Structure formats: C-alpha cells, structure tokens
A paper describes a structure:
The viral surface spike (S) protein is a key target for prophylactic measures as it is critical in the viral life cycle and the primary target of neutralizing antibodies. S is a large, trimeric glycoprotein that mediates both binding to host cell receptors and fusion of virus and host cell membranes, through its S1 and S2 subunits, respectively. In the prefusion state, the S-protein’s RBD domains alternate between open (‘up’) and closed (‘down’) conformations. The receptor-binding site, which can bind to human angiotensin-converting enzyme 2 (ACE2), is transiently exposed in the ‘up’ conformation.
In addition, A942P was selected for its strong enhancement of protein yields. These mutations were combined with hinge loop prolines resulting in two combos, a quadruple mutant S-closed + Fd containing D614N + A892P + A942P + V987P and a quintuple mutant S-closed + Fd + K986P. All combos displayed higher thermal stability with only a single Tm50 at about 66 °C and decreased levels of ACE2 and antibody binding compared to S-2P control. The S-closed+Fd quadruple mutant was then imaged by cryo-EM. A 2-steps 3D classification illustrates that out of 833,000 classified particles, ~80% was closed with all RBDs in the down state and 38% was categorized into a well-defined closed class while ~20% showed 1 RBD-up. Further processing of the 320,000 closed conformation particles allowed us to obtain a 2.8 Å electron potential map for the closed conformation and a 3.0 Å electron potential map for the 1 RBD-up (one up) conformation. The stabilizing mutations and presence of K986, which interacts with Asp427 in the RBD of the neighboring monomer and Glu748 in S2, allow the S trimer to maintain predominantly the closed prefusion configuration.
Residue numbers in the entry:
A (entry chain B): 50 to 66, 82 to 131, 164 to 172, 186 to 196, 200 to 211, 215 to 242, 265 to 433
B (entry chain B): 962 to 1147
C (entry chain B): 641 to 675, 689 to 721
D (entry chain C): 722 to 811, 813 to 827, 856 to 1057
C-alpha cells in the first residue's frame, strides 16, 4: 500500500490531436505511428526571464537542458508510449505495441531523475493524451517476478475502499466497516462581548497642550481594550514606529502596563526619540532604554 | 506484530542499524529508547490478546472434552447437548486444531392425531398406564408408548389401578381386558 | 434509492416488504442480501410460523422416525 | 417457582481511535501515524466484541425453528399462564417482561443490537407457547401437542412421582402454581435489587465509558489537556513534544478500555453460554441435573426476556 501521486482510475484524460498547466504532475500518453512527438518544454512562463526545462529526443540523442544561463545539460497507432512527469524532476515511462486508450494494465518503470528543482506550472509538447496526477493511496499487487500486475485505487468507489482495508483483492461476502464519515464544519464563528472600554488615547493624542521635552508628561493607559488601528492607520502622523513589537501586531497581544509620555521637540531632533539614541533630547531630557519596548 | 517493526514510534527510523550507523551514543540512546518503548508496547498488546484468546480456546477445549466424555463415551440426556434430537451416539473425527463430532440422533418423523385420556374407568376404578399413553383411533382405546405409535390392547398389565372414577378430570371408559380370566375359564 | 433504517442510512440497497432468514446482518432487525439481481434490505424473519393444534384431549404421536 | 437472572449481552460500542486521540486536528493525526497500526487493531478488537454480543443473543434465544403460538382457548388443565404469555394489547411483551423492562434503568458510538427487543419477545413467546402446547417434544423434532395436564403428569413421572399423584391432586397443584406465579410478580415489583445481575452489567459499561471520556481531560504531563491550546500557544518543535505526551496518554487510555472490554466480554460470553445451556436443558426439556434449574426437583422452566 503506497500513498503517492497517481492517475485516478477511470478519470477523464484530455485528448489532443497548446500549453497546458502541470498542476501537480502529468500523465502523458501518445498513440503514435509517425513519431511527430519529439519533446517537451516545461516551466512557468516558457518565455525568458525564468528557467524553463527543455527536453528533446532527436533521432539519436536526448538533449536535456535547463536554459542562456544554463544550469544543467544531460545527453544520452501501434506505438502506445506512456510517460509520467512529477516533481526534483522524475520521469517514468513505458512503451507497448497495441492493436482509443487500451483496456489492460501495465506498470511504468522509471527512466530519469533530474536533480534540478525548477519551478514548473505550465508545459507544452514538441511535435496524445494528457492526464493529471492526484495524491492517492494505491494498493499494488507485486507478482512473483516483482512486477506490478494489478492495482487498486483506494478512493474509486466503496468496493475499492473495502479491498484496501482488507489489504486484499478478493472480498468474501459480509459487511465491513471501512471508513468514518464526518460532517465537515461549513464555516467559522468568532464571538466575543461588546468592544467597549478602549484605552483613552483621546487624552494623549487629542489633547490641547504638548508639554516640554525636558519636562515630558507621562500618563497611564491600562485596564482597557486599546484600539491599535487608529494610530497606525491614520496618515495624519508624520512618524509612527515601534522598537520591540510589530506595529501591525498590537491589535492581538496584551500588556500589563501602558505608559504614554508626550513632549514637544524640534523636528530635526525627532530622530533622537528611539532606543539607543544620543543627544540633549536623548540624554539630558529623555533617554530611552536601549531595549525599550513600545512605540514612538 | 511483525508490521509493528516498521514504525518509528517517533524515532528517526524504524531500522535500528540506521540509528546505530548514523548517530553517536548520547543521541542514539534517545532514538533507540523511543523504538524500545514502542516495540515493547506492541509485544505486550500481542501477549495480552493471546492470553485472552487462549482462555477462550480452553473454554472450548473443556467443552469438547465434556462432549467427548458425555457424548461419545456414553449416551446423554442433556437436551441439545449432543445434537438436535434424542441422542443415540456420537463419533469423534480429528480435524486440524479441533475435533468434529458426528452426533447420531433419533428424530420422530411421521405423526398422527389421536384422542387421549388420562385414565380409564373400569369398575369404578381408575386405571393409569404403566408406561405410555391411552390413545383412541376414534372408536377403540389402546395404550401406546409415547415416542412411537405402537398400540397394544389395554390390559391389567399395561395399567395400574389407583383411586376410583370420581376424582380424575377427563377420565373415560373401556373394558380393561384381564388376561387371566380366560385361563381361569379354560 | 436511499433507505433510513434504525441503524443508519442505507444507500444502494433496495427496500423490500418480504422477510427472509438473515443473510448479512445490518442491525436493529434489518438484514441485506444479494438476490435483475441486486441488493435488498428487509426486516429479518424469525422463522416460519406454526401453531400446534392444542386441545384438552388431542395428542400427536409419531408413527415413524429418522436417524439423523 | 423460583427466578434466575442471567446476563446475555453487553452494549456494542465502537470508538473512532483518531477522534478520541487526535480529535479534529491534522498535526495530531500525522503524529499519530507514527504509531503504526494501533488504531486499526483497537477497532478490530471492539468489532469482535460487538459481533460476539449478537452471537450471544442468537444462541440463547434463537433455539426454536418455528414460531409457535398459543391457541386462543386457554384450557390448560387449570393452570393460568396469563402473566407470562404475551400481552396482545401492549410491544407484545408479557406482564412479567414489562416489570423487568421497567426495573432496569468524542468519537464514541453505540451500535444497535441485531435483534430488537420485539424480536427477542417473539422468541420467548415462541418457546413459551411450544412448551405449553407440546411439552419437550418441540425441541427434539416436530412439535407434538399434548394436554397440559398430561404433560405435567409426564413430568411428575420424570421426577419419580407416580402420575396418579398429579391427576388426583390436579386442582391443588394448579392452585399452587398460580399462586407461585403471583408471588413472582410481587417479588419483582417490590424490590429492585433482584435484577442487580443485569443492572450491574449496564452500570459497568457506563462507568467504563465515562472514565474513558474523562481521560480526555488529563495533561499526562503536557502543558494542557486541550490539544488546540497546545497547538495555538507553542511553536511546532515544542508543540510536537507536548502533543506526543498527549497522544501517548490517550492511546494508553484506549488500550486500557479495550482490554477491560475484552475481559468483560469473556465474562459475558461465559454467562451467555450458561444461559443457552439452561434454555436447552431446562426449558426445552426436563433436567435431572441437581440444582441446575432451581432448588427442588425440576418440573418445567419459563423463559422471560429482560434488558
Ligand atoms: C379402531 O380400533 C378398532 C379396534 O377394535 C379397529 O378394529 C379392527 O380393525 C382391524 C383392521 O381394520 C380388523 O381386522 C379388526 O377385526 C377390527 N376389530 C374390531 C373389534 O373392529 C379399527 O380398525 C380401528 N380404526 C382404524 C381406523 O384403524
Ligand atoms: C364412564 O363409565 C362409567 C361407568 O362406571 C359411567 O358412570 C355412570 O354414569 C351414569 C350416567 O352418567 C350414572 O347413572 C352411573 O351412576 C355412573 N356410574 C358410576 C360408577 O360412575 C360414566 O358415565 C361413563 N362416562 C361417560 C362419559 O358416559
Ligand atoms: C388468570 O389470572 C389473571 C390474574 O391477573 C386473572 O385476571 C383477573 O381476572 C379477574 C376476574 O376474571 C378480574 O376481575 C381481574 O381484573 C383480572 N386481572 C387481570 C390483571 O387480568 C384471570 O381471570 C385468570 N384467569 C382465569 C381463567 O381465572
Ligand atoms: C517471470 O518471468 C519469466 C520470464 O523470464 C517467466 O518464465 C515467469 O513465468 C515469470 N513469472 C511470473 C510469476 O509470471
Ligand atoms: C391434527 O389436527 C389439526 C386440526 O384438527 C391439524 O392442524 C394437524 O395437522 C393434525 N395433525 C396431523 C399430524 O395431521
Ligand atoms: C375439553 O374441552 C372441551 C371443549 O370443547 C370441553 O367440552 C370439555 O369438557 C373439556 N374437557 C375437560 C376434561 O375439561
Ligand atoms: C418410515 O419412513 C421410511 C422412509 O424414511 C419408509 O420407508 C417406511 O415405510 C416408513 N414406515 C412406515 C411404517 O410408514
């Protein structure tokens, strides 16, 4: 039993005879006779200013590139060719002669592992069926030779979940408890009491007389629910900074004591209002502890 | 049990040699301790399950021994202990990890309705069957054994006298043939 | 094809008004079985009914037997 | 007429190991994946217990092929079974079965018994009707009718008393039987502790469940018993350790619960096998085993269903 990226059984594989997203992994089959199908581009834009993997299977050699600024370069309808591309980069494949898409079963022995770590969101074929892969739990039946002769897609239908539960491919008659149904929560609710009792910055910020810098006034704010949106969200202030917090985090945490000192300073000496600050306003009038926690 | 050897239980690897080959003593001790805790708990669960299951099996084995004694080595009266029917005999057949009894029983098969009475008035005497029941085919009265219709004629040998006609509820009437009267007459 | 039984919601089994010996027990009296063919859910049957012809002077006495 | 109470089945329960342990949380569930197949074998154990309960009831009661029914005319020689025969008006339970049914009072789920109480009552009614109308013959083959007085005369022969002794004392015996049944009614109606054997069973399971749920309220050494709060207060490297402590504790609580249930289900199965044996040898026939079927020389037995 393996949990990996696979092609959900019976899924609608798109048929082409353009560029396609890669969402999480791509199955690629092609029924070919004339071998127009050569190669692949993968990437995010496939235009320059980003790295877009290129693969070419040209007639003797397998050019593989991550281009300039190239970071890597590897070198090496009866045709049913199957390929799997997942992300570093791993390609599996297979090739059978068949005589649209065939009923039956065959595994895909890997071919290549490009340790490249590209960012891929789109891809195109270099001149077939495109499937996408999902995170599914399969139950694989390794035969005596060590080959995969059958699989079970454990989310195809109830019977498949049964078989996976028993770790068996044949189910005797009975009732089996295979899973657990749960009604999921459809939404979230956040409720608290009314939002009264705000710290009165209306006395500190909406005052009428800003006292001296040397004799700076210090009032207490505490035992409230302090609005932190207004001060940092108003554009009226010419300076809003903090030295110990995220100033965009005040509306969550809580504090034992809040102190607010107000002073009138020269604009130029305003910079001297900070932890670890030097100057007359900084030393002789108001010194901020080098590890001061709060805001200016 | 075996599968529980593949679980990390929190360690960095279920394989003990990997932890040993990838870590020094002071840290491998921590990881190996996590493994030891998990695997020890797995053994304990296995052993507890086995103890309970073995108790159930020996209850079954004591029952099998009882069936062998009372059922093969004898003839049981205990109802449905030795098969559905009146037990006749049993034969034990060995099977892998167990035993199989073939219970030979007697099942009454083809049955008839009869009219019945608890006693019989003869001379102001009440006669009861020694063993059997009084049955009437419609006109005449016989006494039969209870488990197989075999009517004999009612005589003073099939029956015993007790009391008189005026107490039993449902008593009826017939001759009760006396075998010795013809001999005293002949 | 959805049937609400005392044991829960049964989906994909065809409710029936008959009653048979329990094949697959579902619970609270309901069984289910495979019987064109489909899966049916029914209240189980305790056994074929019978009524002994009791009367105060009737007796039934076997006239034959079978060794079983 | 004495009374014997026997437990037969427990409550079928099942526990979704992952809700109990990691209730509605993915960090916890992925930590729990490391413990292997503990949860699946807990569920396997509990499922075995539940199936066993259904088998216990099936063995005790479903011992009758057909469903016999008493005739509308009730001339049973003077005996009056009206207090054990089913009540057509009422769940078609008898009077005494009604006394009995009255006198007994997170990821966890309770499964319903396979045989509903109505079907259990039909089973015991069938056994009762078969016994009354046919004697012990219905348990050995085809039910053969026999007048009840004559059946009881057979049983008197069975205990070694000549059968003239019944026919000559039929009214007296019938009166004593009817009186004894009335006293059964009174003895049950008055005192509750009589059904302790059954009631205890219920209590035990209930207690064992409460304890289980209460274990969700323990730290087991973590900083909190609330998985969400551990999650929302600590950074994943440390929340993982605290959650590991919680998972170990809760998983051990489940293992304790399941082991207790297994041992208890062994007790109940032993009792249910005893009850099945008593049904067979004691209701379906007349027993020579001493004190297997009450104190005295056994004549007949009457099965009544109870919770
Ligand atoms: C009812 O019982 C009487 C016994 O008296 C049976 O009568 C005998 O029947 C056999 C065969 O039918 C004759 O050979 C005898 O001569 C009869 N004897 C008398 C006295 O009648 C009668 O057959 C029984 N009824 C049935 C249906 O078997
Ligand atoms: C059974 O036989 C007895 C014979 O002893 C019948 O008893 C007689 O019945 C008649 C009328 O019922 C009375 O006048 C006699 O005095 C009775 N004699 C005795 C000794 O009881 C009895 O009636 C018969 N049963 C039936 C149903 O007829
Ligand atoms: C069998 O016993 C029951 C006792 O419950 C008798 O029922 C009572 O019968 C009397 C008179 O028939 C009534 O006044 C009571 O109300 C009945 N009580 C109940 C609970 O039914 C019944 O009569 C008895 N059977 C016979 C034939 O006497
Ligand atoms: C494995 O392959 C060989 C061919 O080399 C074949 O003989 C054998 O049957 C195969 N085993 C199975 C189980 O098919
Ligand atoms: C006895 O008679 C009743 C009805 O009179 C009938 O139902 C029953 O089958 C009869 N017994 C036999 C063995 O035929
Ligand atoms: C048996 O029942 C019938 C009902 O038809 C009745 O006439 C008869 O008197 C009863 N016999 C006894 C002994 O009570
Ligand atoms: C008893 O049944 C057998 C068949 O099982 C039959 O051959 C035989 O004749 C029957 N006996 C009587 C007396 O009818």
């Amino acid at each position: 039993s393996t949990q990996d990226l696979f092609l959900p059984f019976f899924s609608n594989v798109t048929w082409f005879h353009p560029v396609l997203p890669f969402n999480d992994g791509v199955y690629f089959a092609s029924t070919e006779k004339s071998n127009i199908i050569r190669g692949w581009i993968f990437g995010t834009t496939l235009d320059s200013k980003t790295q877009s993997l290129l693969i070419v299977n040209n007639a003797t050699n397998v050019v593989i590139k991550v281009c300039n600024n190239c970071t890597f370069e590897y070198v090496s309808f009866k045709n049913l060719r199957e390929f799997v591309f997942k992300n570093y980069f791993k390609i599996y494949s297979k090739h059978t002669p068949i005589n649209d898409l065939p009923q039956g079963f065959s595994a895909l022995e890997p071919l290549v592992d490009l340790p490249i770590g590209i960012n891929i969101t789109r891809f195109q074929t270099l001149l077939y069926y495109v499937g996408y892969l999902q995170p599914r739990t399969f139950l694989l039946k390794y035969n005596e030779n060590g080959t995969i002769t059958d699989a079970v897609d454990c989310a195809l239908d109830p019977l498949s979940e049964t078989k996976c539960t028993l770790k068996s491919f044949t189910v005797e008659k009975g009732i089996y408890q295979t899973s657990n149904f749960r009604v999921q929560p459809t939404e979230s609710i956040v409720r608290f009491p009314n939002i009264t009792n705000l710290c009165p910055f209306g006395e500190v910020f909406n005052a009428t007389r800003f006292a001296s810098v040397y004799a700076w006034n210090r009032k207490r704010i505490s035992n409230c629910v302090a609005d932190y949106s207004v001060l940092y969200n108003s554009a009226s202030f010419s300076t809003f900074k903090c030295y110990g917090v995220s100033p965009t985090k005040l509306n969550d945490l809580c504090f034992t004591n809040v102190y607010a000192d107000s002073f009138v300073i020269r604009g130029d000496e305003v910079r001297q209002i900070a932890p670890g600050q030097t100057g007359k306003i900084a030393d002789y009038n108001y010194k901020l502890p080098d590890d001061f926690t709060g805001c200016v | 049990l075996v599968k529980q050897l593949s679980s990390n239980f929190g360690a960095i690897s279920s394989v003990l040699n990997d932890i040993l080959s990838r870590l020094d003593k002071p840290e491998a001790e921590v990881q190996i301790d996590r493994l030891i805790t998990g695997r020890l708990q797995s053994l304990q669960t296995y052993v507890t399950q086995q103890l309970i299951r073995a108790a159930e099996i020996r209850a079954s084995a004591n029952l099998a021994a009882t069936k062998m004694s009372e059922c093969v080595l004898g003839q049981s009266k205990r109802v449905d202990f030795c098969g559905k029917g009146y037990h006749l005999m049993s034969f034990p057949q060995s099977a892998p990890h167990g035993v199989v009894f073939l219970h030979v029983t007697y099942v009454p098969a083809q049955e008839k309705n009869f009219t019945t009475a608890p006693a019989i008035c003869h001379d102001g005497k009440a006669h009861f069957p020694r063993e059997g029941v009084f049955v009437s085919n419609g006109t005449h009265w016989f006494v039969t054994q209870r488990n197989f219709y075999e009517p004999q004629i009612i005589t003073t040998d099939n029956t015993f006298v007790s009391g008189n006609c005026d107490v039993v509820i449902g008593i009826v009437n017939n001759t009760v043939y006396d075998p010795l009267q013809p001999e005293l007459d002949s | 094809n959805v049937f609400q039984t005392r044991a829960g919601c049964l989906i994909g089994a065809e409710h029936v008004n008959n009653s048979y010996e329990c094949d697959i027990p579902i619970g609270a009296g309901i069984c289910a079985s495979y019987q064109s063919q489909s899966i049916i859910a029914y209240t189980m049957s305790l056994g074929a009914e019978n009524s002994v012809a009791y009367s105060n002077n009737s007796i039934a006495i076997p006239t034959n037997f079978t060794i079983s | 007429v004495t009374t014997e109470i026997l437990p037969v089945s427990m409550t079928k329960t099942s526990v979704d190991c992952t809700m109990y342990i990691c209730g509605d949380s993915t960090e916890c569930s992925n930590l729990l994946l490391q413990y292997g197949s503990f949860c699946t074998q807990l569920n396997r154990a509990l499922t075995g217990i539940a199936v066993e309960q259904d088998k216990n009831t099936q063995e005790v009661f479903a011992q009758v092929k057909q469903i016999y029914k008493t005739p509308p005319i009730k001339d049973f020689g003077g005996f009056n079974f009206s207090q054990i025969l089913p009540d057509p008006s009422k769940s078609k339970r008898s009077f005494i079965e009604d006394l009995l049914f009255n006198k007994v009072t997170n990821g966890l789920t309770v499964l319903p018994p396979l045989l509903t109480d109505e079907m259990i009552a039909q089973y015991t009614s069938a056994l009762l009707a078969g016994t009354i109308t046919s004697g012990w013959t219905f348990g050995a083959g085809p039910a053969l009718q026999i007048p009840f007085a004559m059946q009881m005369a057979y049983r008197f022969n069975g205990i070694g008393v000549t059968q003239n002794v019944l026919y000559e004392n039929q009214k007296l015996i019938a009166n004593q039987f009817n009186s004894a049944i009335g006293k059964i009614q009174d003895s049950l109606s008055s005192t509750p502790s009589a059904l302790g054997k059954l009631q205890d069973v219920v209590n035990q399971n209930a207690q064992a469940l409460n304890t289980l749920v209460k274990q969700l309220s323990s730290n087991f050494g973590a900083i909190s018993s609330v998985l969400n709060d551990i999650l929302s207060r600590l950074d994943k490297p440390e929340a993982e350790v605290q959650i590991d402590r919680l998972i170990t504790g809760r998983l051990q609580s489940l293992q304790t619960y399941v082991t207790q249930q297994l041992i208890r289900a062994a007790e109940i199965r032993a009792s249910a096998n005893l009850a099945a044996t008593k049904m067979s040898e004691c209701v379906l026939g007349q027993s020579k085993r001493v004190d297997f079927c009450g104190k005295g020389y056994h004549l007949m037995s009457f099965p009544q269903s109870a919770p």
